[PDB]
Design a protein around this ligand. Sequence first.
Ligand SMILES: Nc1nc2c(ncn2[C@@H]2O[C@H](COP(=O)(O)OP(=O)(O)OP(=O)(O)O)[C@@H](O)[C@H]2O)c(=O)[nH]1
Ligand SMILES: Nc1nc2[nH]cnc2c(=O)[nH]1
Ligand SMILES: Nc1nc2[nH]cnc2c(=O)[nH]1
Length: 613
Amino acid sequence: PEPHAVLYVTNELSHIVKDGFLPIWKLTGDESLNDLWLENGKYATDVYAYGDVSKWTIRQLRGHGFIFISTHKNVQLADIIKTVDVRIPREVARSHDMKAFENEIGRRRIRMRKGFGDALRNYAFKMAIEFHGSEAETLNDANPRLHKIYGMPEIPPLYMEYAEIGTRFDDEPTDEKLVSMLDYIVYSAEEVHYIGCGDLRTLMQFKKRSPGRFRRVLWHVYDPIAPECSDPNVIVHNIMVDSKKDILKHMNFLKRVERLFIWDVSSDEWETTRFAEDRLGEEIAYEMGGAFSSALIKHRIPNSKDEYHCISTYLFPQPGADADMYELRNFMRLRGYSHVDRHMHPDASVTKVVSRDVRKMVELYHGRDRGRFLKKRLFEHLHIVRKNGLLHESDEPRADLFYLTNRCNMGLEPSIYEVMKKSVIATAWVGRAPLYDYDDFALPRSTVMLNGSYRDIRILDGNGAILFLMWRYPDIVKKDLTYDPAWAMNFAVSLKEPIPDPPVPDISLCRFIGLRVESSVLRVRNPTDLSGHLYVTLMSGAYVTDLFWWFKMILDWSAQNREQKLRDLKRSAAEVIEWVRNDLIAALREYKRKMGMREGASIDSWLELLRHL
Ligand SMILES: Nc1nc2c(ncn2[C@@H]2O[C@H](COP(=O)(O)OP(=O)(O)OP(=O)(O)O)[C@@H](O)[C@H]2O)c(=O)[nH]1
Ligand SMILES: Nc1nc2[nH]cnc2c(=O)[nH]1
Ligand SMILES: Nc1nc2[nH]cnc2c(=O)[nH]1
């Protein structure tokens, strides 16, 4: 909408900037603190800044919108010694193209999105059980034996009942057929019975690529040719498999587990044998549905048969697979213990398949330069419960990140606010700019501010949001984390967290950049100082902060005293950037006078809390 970043560059970089078309903020290591706040408030776009800033802490500098561009790895601040956000490569300085440099900032800035979202997610894992609007990324960092991960991910190409296919989507190369296999099917299994594992290259490559979850799984792997593997989570069997009894002697029943059965059995003048292998893997797993949560059975399509049967839940194509590779993978969901409730995926049952259509799947989706997104989709479809955030009622604490304000949801704001009333942490796109690579809609900021602040709920903007976890949780959100304040500021974030006692005016709360510019605009376009101050911040819709906590510091706190209030700052380990009950009631009224029905309740909710408090 308006928020910007200060694109702070270090000395060696300065001269190039000066050729740009963006503003240039020049320091000057003095500067007092209220000097920064009034200057920084002049810039409606992003800006460049250079010159000495050794006086200020990081939290301060992030409050302002600072992103650090330098050629060297870090810059000396007052707080700590920060890792430069954007490292300019030598040969890309240097050179002194103002464009190359600008495009270089952009790219990195786009990479920084993940750090912001990680920080939030990373808190949310510490503080919640349910997760909604989830996706591969959320799955990746989850404990699947603790967290419960939901959403409505975009369903892959599938065969059953059914079929429906295509339609076709753009796609890219991935890991080889058989490492890409493990990649999507290993998420919540604790014990894998891999049948026909071969030379074990497939498994070793999985180990070298995906080391965590390889280590966290027990592998009984089965093959006459299977080589010795020292690996202690890898129990090897030189047996050849023709029945369930071959696998049963290698299972603990006195102890619960999620088991996954994987069948990849091929021999060495028709091949109606390829067939009865595929079918035997099915037949074995089916006898053992009860022990296994699921199966992933090899599925080679016959030429000889025009239509045939099998026991299946799903039949899908294989990422990383060759274009001429005429082999699908069969998924059987079974009953057996699981950490993921998979009951939405039908019980494995007899399926009549039409070759020609199975034959089509391969044609459309296979390719040794295709599969990256297919693998993803398979991963989510298999392992995320298909539940709709807004409609889901939860007995356990719930996280609601980066989905709420998707276009899919438009017109359903009520259901949204409802979520942010009782979510551990959720987020709302509030950005009003052009605004690319993202397809959410914005919630008016006032309405967010006004709707979202409950006793237990701390309504902040992304950047404030972050600053707050730094301040109260130093090791969930490090000080040194790299992120993009301007982007953080495109979100409203809400956290089930108490108001600080004593409610000190820490940066996470009080920043209000360019408020003076913001106020004069109000007045040249739609006209009508702690009163005018509260009004402005609402009318502008250019800031999300936490009404409740804010109120409580204004009255219950300032004053208090020059002396006895800093003191409670010190102490609070808090910091700031800017150095009566009736003004505010007037403020609200005025605001609601200009907008009945675009709001307000609520409003009359906050008002009846002033003349009462
Ligand atoms: N399976 C299958 N293959 C087909 C079909 N139509 C053409 N083919 C070709 O026939 C070959 C598959 O039959 P086979 O000779 O038994 O080979 P395979 O068991 O699939 O495996 P490879 O030895 O790696 O080719 C491949 O080259 C396919 O491209 C079809 O409808 N189904
Ligand atoms: N900043 C940001 N981080 C993310 N991490 C995962 N998704 C997102 C997103 O949409 N934005
Ligand atoms: N199979 C698979 N696909 C993904 N897509 C994004 N992350 C992953 C992952 O860990 N496994």
